[PDB]
RNA sequence: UUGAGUGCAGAAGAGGAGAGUGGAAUUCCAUGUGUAGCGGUGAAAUGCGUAGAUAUAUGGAGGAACACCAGUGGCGAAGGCGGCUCUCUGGUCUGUAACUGACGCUGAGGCUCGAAAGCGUGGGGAGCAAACAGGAUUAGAUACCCUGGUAGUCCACGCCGUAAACGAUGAGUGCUAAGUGUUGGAGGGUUUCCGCCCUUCAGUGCUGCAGCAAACGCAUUAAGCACUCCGCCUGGGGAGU
């Protein structure tokens, strides 16, 4: 009964879709685990590598506490 | 490893007859080109230990097939080792 | 003097001492206060009893130079910052930003030995 | 087959107008001059950055699509020329799926 | 052709090496602001500070390790492997069957790999810290406690080849009730399937019949019923001398 992103077939994360990607981060700048969102297994790894690419090109800072 | 282009080259210019993709005369030439390329990789990178185990397994299996074929027809065996360039 | 009148205070605390300093928005310093500097000795500097009077001895010298608003910055999580803020409100300040920035690594260097006690 | 290598490289916002086209066309030459085959190399987005690099908290992104076999040498040559420059800040080369 | 292998179609993955790169945090240096303490303990002391410390903002230098993701999750023959981008390259699973036609398994001698600590040659030191110095505790303390501090920990190239290297359970195959999670698949019912339900493959946990066991316990990932091959044992010390 838990949340997911597999209904809308975003089959490739596109490395740029950072406005949809805001679902899976937090205020402090961390990652919600799969215990939180209830997403898929391999989808979690894809999103994880995706946002680690995204943290490098100025699309999300590491530290956001200001 | 090898691409399917040179793979499908050598599995058909060395096959016995039509439909042969088993036929242990084929597999030894396939393994021969594979272990030559892996030998060149081991010469380039000389501490990739986890692929050298695969070299050991391939050369052992080619040895088993090569010693199989000699216990059936020594003439085919001689023709291949005069043809494929091995057995020092 | 110059009556800057809008600054940030800094609360730095250990497990055996604490230091409060009220600074500017830079923060260039106005006045600091230390639990050892107010006559305490030994282990008593851990308790927030020194935090209240350290905040008082800071704010007196602070608003002699003119001071209205203040922001809170917290380091070194222990006992001091729990009562330093509410004692800092007591001598007439305008606390409006409370943050707890901790110097946190991402496993850079090594911590020392454990204590076999 | 070949591959597909995105290059999403950060362009300074304080360049002149011919500087943009001259720089994009020059790096399109150095990809074309060593056998690699570019397809669609456009500008992407003026954007403010999440944090600075030196003082640039804003920038203009870019995107290309080059296809080439792995046996060439321009891609690492593009890396060497990109790191010695200043006007391009950060680039990342990601295989396309 | 049933075992054993290459087809063609896919899939997952901290598998390995080589080359670059990212930010935070510590330490040092510079600058401004700012004065009498900072640091440590059960309690103190050694120590650093008016040659301006600690603290707070700005930069500059360098090394090491990769915060959340992270899960009884994954990979590998084991030792082991977690930031990111790229080149070479090893291995496993699922379908299917045209193709080879018993080509297999185990394997004394031999070879290869093999955590930390250690040795040689040449680099670098951010922390941490054997040896050592000082303070403290004690009847005494060549320790536990606090302040410092070298070799080392890192990289490249050679050497040694050990561990509580453990699931303290050698390897190959077949057979013998269930229930429940979870990783990766294939098929069917249904379908915005992304959910769900049924069938089936390879791992991976947890609970429990028969059966075994001196007990504890194990139990389709057997320590059950068996066959093939290898290693080892025969009271404790003396002594892995």
């Amino acid at each position: 009964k838990v949340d997911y992103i597999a209904a809308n077939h975003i089959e490739y994360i596109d490395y740029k879709d950072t406005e949809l990607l805001k679902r899976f981060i937090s205020e402090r700048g961390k990652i919600l685990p799969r215990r939180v969102t209830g997403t898929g297994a391999k989808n979690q790894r894809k999103l994880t590598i995706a946002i680690k690419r995204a943290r490098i090109m100025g699309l999300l800072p590491f530290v956001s506490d200001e | 490893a090898i691409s399917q282009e040179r793979k499908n080259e050598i599995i058909k210019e060395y096959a016995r007859h039509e439909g042969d993709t088993g036929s242990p005369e084929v597999q030894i030439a396939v393994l021969t080109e594979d272990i030559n390329q892996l030998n060149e990789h081991a010469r380039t990178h000389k501490k990739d230990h986890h692929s050298y185990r695969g070299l050991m397994k391939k050369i052992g299996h080619r040895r088993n097939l090569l010693a199989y074929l000699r216990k059936t027809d020594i003439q085919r065996y001689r023709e291949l080792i005069q043809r494929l360039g091995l057995r020092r | 003097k110059k009556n800057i009148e809008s600054g940030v205070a800094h609360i730095h605390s250990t497990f055996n001492n604490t230091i409060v300093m009220i600074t500017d928005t830079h923060g260039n310093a106005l006045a600091w206060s230390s639990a050892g500097s107010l006559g305490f000795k030994g282990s008593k500097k851990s308790t927030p009893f020194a935090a209240q009077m350290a905040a008082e001895a800071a704010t007196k010298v602070a608003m002699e130079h003119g001071l209205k608003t203040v922001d809170v910055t917290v380091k070194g999580p222990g006992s001091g910052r729990e009562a330093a803020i509410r004692s800092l409100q007591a001598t007439g300040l305008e606390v409006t930003a409370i943050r707890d920035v901790t110097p946190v690594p991402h496993n850079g260097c090594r911590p020392p030995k454990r204590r076999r006690v | 087959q070949d591959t597909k290598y995105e290059i999403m490289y950060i362009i300074r916002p304080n360049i002149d107008e011919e500087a943009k086209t001259a720089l994009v066309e020059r790096f399109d030459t150095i990809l074309k001059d060593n056998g690699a085959e570019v397809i669609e190399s456009k500008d992407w987005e003026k954007r403010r950055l999440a944090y600075e690099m030196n003082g640039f908290r804003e920038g203009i992104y870019h995107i290309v699509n080059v296809t080439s076999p792995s046996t060439a040498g321009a891609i690492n040559e593009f890396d060497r020329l990109a790191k010695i420059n200043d006007d391009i800040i950060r680039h990342m080369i990601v295989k396309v799926e």
Side-chain angles (χ1 to χ4, degrees), chain D residues 9-12 49 53-54 56 58 82 86-91:
Chain D
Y9 58 99
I10 294 172
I11 308 168
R12 298 184 299 170
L49 295 176
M53 304 299 173
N54 295 113
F56 296 93
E58 294 170 352
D86 54 356
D87 48 357
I88 297 172
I89 300 170
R90 288 185 180 179
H91 62 279

Side-chain angles (χ1 to χ4, degrees), chain D residues 38-42 63-66:
Chain D
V38 73
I39 296 172
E40 182 177 1
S41 66
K42 304 191 300 296
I63 181 170
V64 307
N65 280 318
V66 62

Side-chain angles (χ1 to χ4, degrees), chain A:
Chain A
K1 75 279 192 185
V2 76
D3 302 331
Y4 52 91
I5 59 169
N8 45 358
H9 280 169
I10 179 70
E11 190 67 26
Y12 177 59
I13 47 91
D14 206 6
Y15 164 69
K16 300 172 289 297
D17 295 334
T18 185
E19 303 295 326
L20 176 60
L21 193 64
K22 298 289 289 185
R23 294 181 179 178
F24 299 100
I25 56 172
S26 66
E27 301 175 356
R28 192 173 175 87
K30 294 184 185 295
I31 297 170
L32 295 174
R34 193 178 67 184
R35 297 193 300 269
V36 175
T37 66
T39 186
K42 66 187 292 182
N43 294 319
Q44 176 63 45
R45 278 90 57 84
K46 288 185 178 180
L47 293 174
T48 303
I49 300 170
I51 68 169
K52 285 187 179 179
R53 267 94 61 87
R55 285 184 176 93
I56 302 170
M57 289 300 173
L59 289 178
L60 185 65
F62 302 109
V63 178
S64 67
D65 286 332
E66 64 184 1

